[PDB]
């Protein structure tokens, strides 16, 4: 019973964000700034309805979805691609498949203890992020 991801979450680790960005074809100059940043994630969740904001000093990215309902996602100001996205529950893990021109693109997000874990995948690259809840 850990599906409730509501809150504001502050990044404490970001493993292989470089490789994930390179797999998305983010240019070197953009990666050079992006890899340095602490990200914050704000999740406003009402059951299966999610409104999410991921923020930093350099880029912000909002994505809203209902679990089980495919949607068009445009990764504006990130890699600027259009995908068909579907978020599902696997147990209490939120699983997103982003179908489009990059193979094996998606993410998984879940709560463990007082941490929010986010694993971002593109191709053969996995980025593992951990966030600590803000009080
Ligand atoms: C927004 C801050 C970025 C800081 C770096 C800036 C520029 C580097 C460009 C591209 C990298 C791709 C990043 C992908 C991040 C997706 C975040 C996402 O979709 O999370 C899901 C799960 O939480 C949303 O519900």
How far is 65 from 55, CA to CA, in rounded Å? 18
How far is 103 from 115, CA to CA, in rounded Å? 29
Residue 13 has a CB neighbour count (10 Å cut-off) of 12
How far is 45 from 52, CA to CA, in rounded Å? 8
- C-alpha closest to that of 7 among 38, 46, 43: 43
Cβ atoms of residues 98 and 105 within 8 Å:
yes
Assess whether the C-beta atom of 21 lies below 6 angstroms from ligand 1.
yes
Cβ atoms of residues 129 and 20 within 8 Å:
no
How many CA atoms lie less than 13 Å away from 46 in the CB half-sphere? 3
Say if residue 129 carries a ligand binding annotation.
no
What is the arrangement of strands in the sheet containing 60-66, beginning at the earlier edge strand?
Answer: 60-66, 49-55, 40-46, 7-15, 125-133, 115-122, 106-112, 93-99, 82-90, 71-74
Contacts of 117 (CB under 8 A, 6+ apart): 108, 109, 110, 111, 128, 129, 130, 131
How far is 52 from 39, CA to CA, in rounded Å? 13
Of the residues 17, 32, 53, 61, which should be mutated to test ligand 1's pocket, given the most ligand atoms within 8 Å of the CB?
A: 61
Assess whether the C-beta atom of 66 lies below 6 angstroms from ligand 1.
no
User: Nearest residue CA, atom 25 of ligand 1?
Assistant: 52
How far CA 20 is from CA of 26, 48, 54, in Å, comes to 9, 27, 16
How far is 128 from 15, CA to CA, in rounded Å? 5
How far is 40 from 42, CA to CA, in rounded Å? 7
Q: H-type helices in the chain, by residue range?
A: 17-23, 28-34
Instruction: Please give the method by which this entry was determined.
Output: X-ray
Burial tier of 39 (Cβ tally within 10 Å: 0-12, 13-18, 19+): buried
């Amino acid at each position: 019973m850990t599906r409730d991801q509501n809150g504001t979450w502050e990044m404490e680790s970001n493993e292989n964000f470089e490789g994930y960005m390179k797999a998305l074809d983010i240019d070197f100059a953009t990666r050079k700034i992006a890899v340095r940043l602490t990200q914050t994630k704000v999740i406003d969740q009402d059951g299966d309805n999610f409104k999410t904001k991921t923020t930093s000093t350099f880029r912000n990215y909002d994505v809203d979805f209902t679990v089980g309902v495919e949607f068009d996602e445009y990764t504006k100001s990130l890699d600027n691609r259009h995908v068909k996205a579907l978020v599902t529950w696997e147990g209490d893990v939120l699983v997103c498949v982003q179908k489009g021109e990059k193979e094996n693109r998606g993410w998984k997000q879940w709560i463990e203890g007082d941490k929010l874990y986010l694993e971002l995948t593109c191709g053969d690259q996995v980025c593992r992020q951990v966030f600590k809840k803000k009080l």
